C-alpha cells in the first residue's frame, strides 16, 4: 500500500488534493490525473516563491524565512507578481521605493 | 487531559518537505508558514474554479487533469505557466506508469 | 456593557504621516489627515459589515478572523496570513 | 394512509390463498382501505421489486417478471 | 377512488412569481454550488431576479416612452442603469453592449458662459 | 427536412411577462432582451456563488433560503438590497403558505 | 501585416470624444494604439485558449465572453 503522491514522485498530498476536489462542488465527477496535476502545480509554485523568500533571507543573515522575505520574493519577481496581485502579505511592508522628484539634486 | 484540540488541517508540512529540497540550511517562521498556507490554498481555489468553469462550460460533469491544465495556463503567467504545466504533466506521466 | 466613545480620532496625525511615509510621500498638506480618516472610516464600514454579516449568518456573537478574511476577500482586498 | 410496504404487509398476512400469493389478489384486497391514486399499481410493483431483493419478501416460483411469494424468508 | 386526488400545479404560481421557481432550482443542483438544495431558495432567488429584472424594465420602459418608442434598447437600459446610482453601483464593472454612455462633458472644458 | 437548431434555454418569456406588468404596452429589442438575459444570468450566478461559499465556510451541505438572503445583503447595495429580501421573504411566505 | 495602423487616428479621436475628451496630444495616437493591442492580447489569448479547450478551430462569441468574464471586463448582450 502506497501514496499517490510517491506514485507521482512528489511532496504535496495527491490524496488530500483529491478529495478538497471532490468535497468542494468544483464537478460531480473527478478525473484520476486532476489531483496529480494539480497537487504538482501547487508544489511547484510553493517551491519557487520558496527559492526566492530563502534568497531574501539569506540576503538579511536571517536563517528563517519571515514575511518579509516572502513580500520581497513576491513583489520583485515580476511573474510572482502579477499572480499575487490582489493579495496582501501580513506583516510584509513595501519595496524600498522613493520617487525620483522627491530626492534632492545629486551633485 | 480535559478535551484535545480538534484537527486543523494544514499544507505545512508539506511546505517544509518542499523547502528543505530547496534551501535545506533555511527554516521558516510561524506568520510566514501561515501565508504559505493562504497562497496554497489561494491557488487551489482559483485553479479548482478555472478548471469547474471550464468543465461547466463544455457541459462536462468530471474536471479532469485536462481542465487543471488548461486552467492553469488561464491562471499563470509565461513562465511560471510552463514550469507548471511542464510540473504537472510529468507527474501525471510518472503516476500512470507506476499504476 | 458600554456604547463605545468617539475614536476615529486615535487615528493621529503622526500615525497618518507613518503611513503616508511607507508610500514614498515626501510633504503633506494639513487637509490630508481629515480626508483620511473618512477614506479610513469608510474602508472600515465596509469591511466590517460584510465580516459581521457572515458573524450573523454563522449566528454567532463574536467576530472571527475568518469573518475578516472572507469580507476581506469579497471586498477584492484579499489577506494572506490569517487563515484559508 | 400508510406506506406500500405497509400496504404489501396487509393482503398477504390477512388471508394467505391465491397462488401463494401473487400479483392481482394482493392489488383487489390492497385498493379497499389504501384509497387508489393511478401510481398505486406503478409503486405496488415497485415496492415488490426492492422488497424481493433485499430479504423481507422471498419468491416460491417464477421467471423474471411473473412469479408468487411469501413472507418468511427461505431458510428462516 | 373515494379522492385521492391528482392536481397539478406550478411551483412559480404557489409563490406568486413570474420567474420560473422550476428553473432555478433545477440550475443549483446542477450548478456545482452544493451538494443539496432547500425547498426555498429557488422561490427566494427567483424572487429577487424577478425584482430586480421588473426594476431596470420598469426604468428603461420609462426611458424609452420619453424618447418617442415603445421598444426598449440597449440604450435604454445603459440610461436606466447608469442614471439610478444603485443599479449603476451593481453593474459597475459590467459593459452594455451597444449602450454607449451618459452625456458628460467635464466643466473646465465648457467655455466661459455668455 | 431541416430540424438542428440545439435548443438553447433563456430567461427572454419570464423578461416579456415581468415587462408586460411594468409596461403593457412596451415591447423589446433582440439585443436589449440579450443583454436582459446576460443580466439575469449574472446575478444568479452572483448570488448561487456566494450563498455556495456561506455554505462551505459553516461547514454545510445545503444552500438554503437563507444563504440566498445572505448572499442578497452581500451583493446588493442598500435600498436594492432591502426591496430583494423584502421580496425574497414575501415570495417564500407565500409559497409555504400554498403548499 | 500591420493591422494596427488600421486604428485610425480619426477612429481614435472619436472614442476620446465619446470620453469627453476636448483636445488630444500627436503622441496619443500611437499611445492608444499600443494600449488597445495589449488589450486584445489579454482578451484574445483567453478566448482561444476556451476554444482549443473545447477543441475547435472557430472562435465563439462565448469563447470571448468567458474571457472577457475572467478579465474583469464581463459583457452584456452576447450570451452571458
Ligand atoms: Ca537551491
Ligand atoms: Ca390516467
Ligand atoms: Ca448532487
Known amino acids: ?107 | 487531559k480535559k478535551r484535545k484540540r480538534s484537527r486543523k488541517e494544514s499544507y505545512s508540512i508539506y511546505v517544509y518537505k518542499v523547502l528543505k529540497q530547496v534551501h535545506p540550511d533555511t527554516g521558516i517562521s510561524s506568520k510566514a508558514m501561515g501565508i504559505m498556507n493562504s497562497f496554497v490554498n489561494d491557488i487551489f481555489e482559483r485553479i479548482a474554479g478555472e478548471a469547474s468553469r471550464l468543465a461547466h462550460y463544455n457541459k462536462r460533469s468530471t474536471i479532469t487533469s485536462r481542465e487543471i491544465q488548461t486552467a492553469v495556463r488561464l491562471l499563470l503567467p509565461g513562465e511560471l505557466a510552463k514550469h507548471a504545466v511542464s510540473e504537472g504533466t510529468k507527474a501525471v506521466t510518472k503516476y500512470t506508469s507506476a499504476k | 456593557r458600554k456604547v463605545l466613545r468617539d475614536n476615529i480620532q486615535g487615528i493621529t496625525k503622526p500615525a497618518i504621516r507613518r503611513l503616508a511615509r511607507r508610500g514614498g510621500v515626501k510633504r503633506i498638506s494639513g487637509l490630508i489627515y481629515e480626508e483620511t480618516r473618512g477614506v479610513l472610516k469608510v474602508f472600515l464600514e465596509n469591511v466590517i459589515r460584510d465580516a459581521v454579516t457572515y458573524t450573523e449568518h454563522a449566528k454567532r456573537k463574536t467576530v472571527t478572523a475568518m469573518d475578516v478574511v472572507y469580507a476581506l476577500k469579497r471586498q477584492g482586498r484579499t489577506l494572506y496570513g490569517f487563515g484559508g | 394512509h400508510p406506506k406500500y410496504s405497509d400496504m404489501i404487509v396487509a393482503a398477504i398476512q390477512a388471508e394467505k390463498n391465491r397462488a401463494g400469493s401473487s400479483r392481482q389478489s394482493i392489488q383487489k384486497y390492497i385498493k379497499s382501505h389504501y384509497k387508489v391514486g393511478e401510481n398505486a399499481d406503478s409503486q405496488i410493483k415497485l415496492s415488490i421489486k426492492r422488497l424481493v431483493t433485499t430479504g423481507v419478501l422471498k419468491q416460491t416460483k417464477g421467471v423474471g417478471a411473473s412469479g408468487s411469494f411469501r413472507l418468511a424468508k427461505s431458510d428462516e
Open chain 1, 1 to 107: 500500500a502506497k501514496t499517490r503522491s510517491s506514485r507521482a514522485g512528489l511532496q504535496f498530498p495527491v490524496g488530500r488534493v483529491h478529495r478538497l476536489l471532490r468535497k468542494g462542488n468544483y464537478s460531480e465527477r473527478v478525473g484520476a490525473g486532476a489531483p496529480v496535476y494539480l497537487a504538482a502545480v501547487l508544489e511547484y509554485l510553493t517551491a519557487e516563491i520558496l527559492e526566492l523568500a530563502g534568497n531574501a533571507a539569506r540576503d538579511n543573515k536571517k536563517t528563517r524565512i519571515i514575511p518579509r522575505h516572502l513580500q520581497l520574493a513576491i513583489r520583485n519577481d515580476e511573474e510572482l507578481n502579477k499572480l499575487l496581485g490582489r493579495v496582501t502579505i501580513a506583516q510584509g511592508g513595501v519595496l524600498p521605493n522613493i520617487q525620483a522628484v522627491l530626492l534632492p539634486k545629486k551633485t
